[PDB]
Symmetry: C2
Subunit: 310 residues, 2 copies
């Protein structure tokens, strides 16, 4: 970037920031144990010195979008989308990425709208549509995704078509909140293929520590979905580290979460250079924060620094 500032984090409140895993605002901070799952999201991954990882790209509005053109599957209301790149050029499967940037990084049924414009006359059309990212034929890395829609006839072939995500759904005849599964990665090249070029899984290692999650509630569109969505970094931090690209002077940036209403620190945390945050706590806990609170970088420390409990 064009500046010449030492390392910092942005002065932004949680509510001023955006989830890096779905195009919705952040609402709250949450910490819980993670030994019972694998935490390997591919969106919202960036080192503190500005290296984008996984499927992470810069604008939050592109997260969980797809673009391309569609072909109807006869005898259904389903369509295959042959993907374009984000700027409508040809999609290139040989790029060293797990999937097109911004592709969904969790297994679930994401609902939104497919929209389309006919080039010759500028006629337009749009329908509700869902992508099941755990389906065998979800293969964005190969350039193909299938959508279930509300039409069997009202999309043209060979015309620009976009999917805009809105929320998630669940089958209400089944155990409530059984999906989405935010920590289950899709198989980006389809069932029984191996993902490539992934951002690594993350876990706290220091005793007494847990991940700190930046949490939103995904809109629900049908049934009884699990709408919790946790990201490792706000999108604005991805954007800021990309732009600043300040070298990490140690493995960990010590951050204090400041309450400007009282002038006191509420808690401190470790921002790991590979791009995730830990805190000293044991158990599930919804943090209760001043709405005008923000994070502040105070010191470079190592991974063996002992945090004050919160």
């Amino acid at each position: 970037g064009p500046g010449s500032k030492p390392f910092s984090v942005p002065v932004l409140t949680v509510e001023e920031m955006t989830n890096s895993r779905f195009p919705i605002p952040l609402e709250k901070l949450f910490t819980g144990p993670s030994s019972a799952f694998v935490v390997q999201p591919q969106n919202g991954r960036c080192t503190t010195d500005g290296v984008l990882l996984g499927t992470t790209q810069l604008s939050p509005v592109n997260i969980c979008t797809f673009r391309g053109d569609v072909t109807h599957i006869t005898g259904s209301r389903n369509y295959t989308m042959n993907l374009a790149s984000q700027n409508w050029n040809n999609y290139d499967p040989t790029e060293e990425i797990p999937a097109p940037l911004g592709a969904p990084d969790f297994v679930g049924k994401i609902q939104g709208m497919l929209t389309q414009t006919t080039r010759a006359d500028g006629s337009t059309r749009g329908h509700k549509a869902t992508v099941y990212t755990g389906s065998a034929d979800f293969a964005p890395k190969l350039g193909r995704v299938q959508f279930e829609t509300d039409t069997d006839h009202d999309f043209e072939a060979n015309q620009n078509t976009k999917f805009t995500p809105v929320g998630v759904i669940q089958d209400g005849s089944t155990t409530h909140r059984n999906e989405p599964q935010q920590w289950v990665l899709p198989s980006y090249s389809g069932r029984n293929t191996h993902n490539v070029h992934l951002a690594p899984a993350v876990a706290p290692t220091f005793p007494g520590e847990q991940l700190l999650f930046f949490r939103s509630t995904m809109p629900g569109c049908s049934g009884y979905p699990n709408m919790d969505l946790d990201c490792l970094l706000p999108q604005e931090w991805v954007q800021y580290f990309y732009q600043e690209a300040a070298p990490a002077q140690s493995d960990v940036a010590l951050l204090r979460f400041v309450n400007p209403d009282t002038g006191r620190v509420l808690f401190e945390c470790k921002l790991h250079k590979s791009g995730y945050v830990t805190v000293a706590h044991t158990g599930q806990h919804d943090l209760v924060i001043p709405p005008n609170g923000y994070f502040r970088f105070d010191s470079w420390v190592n991974q063996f620094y002992t945090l004050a409990p919160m």
Copy 2:
């Protein structure tokens, strides 16, 4: 004072950035005359020293969203939404802004989805919905808007409801591309009321200059809409100026648009302190830019600096 923290613009390409007037990426740059109509958008308004204006707020995903509770209009598929604030608290109509932050700043028919969760059991529902921002009863400043939907019964009252925008429609006539009207501000308190606390209208005043517009194509959902959408500043520039808060040393920052493939400047432009851009050109022109090109601040200059023609 002299020696103030240096101003800059981010190193981001047009395609890496986001429209500040609808939650979609930027696609291109455009210049044309604007003397016959008023250019007074309320989103994407910020001074170079970081003062947000109009209805402008920080995250692009919130633009053209609404949140609140809904009330069915008997005998129709229409719902009144009684607005909440962006963080689900009560909305305050006496705040010194034109309308809730991020509200639409153009007259048009915006289609998306209304989604809702019932608190007691986590049941959910989602439906297509259109808001007409030129409607007599479009009064977001007062805390009320109307949505035409695809249901007459499947929303509950007194439960959190969100509108997520997707794109625009055209109907009510056979004249193509006559709407949306991107430079017509809504009457934010309803028909025959006066708007308040507006960001000012902008115009080129220097002979031979025109505004430079940051352009996207809104998705279309029905009919033959005009999908052009021009903002005065990318959302990332709003975010960056807010965060950096570098003092303006004059009223005009000279930017050069750099082509890293050649090392040479393609064009130069004026970034006015009050937050818009002009170029020296006469006529309508779609700029042909290298996709990796970006803007670079080179100097503060005087109001009446003469730009190189482009």
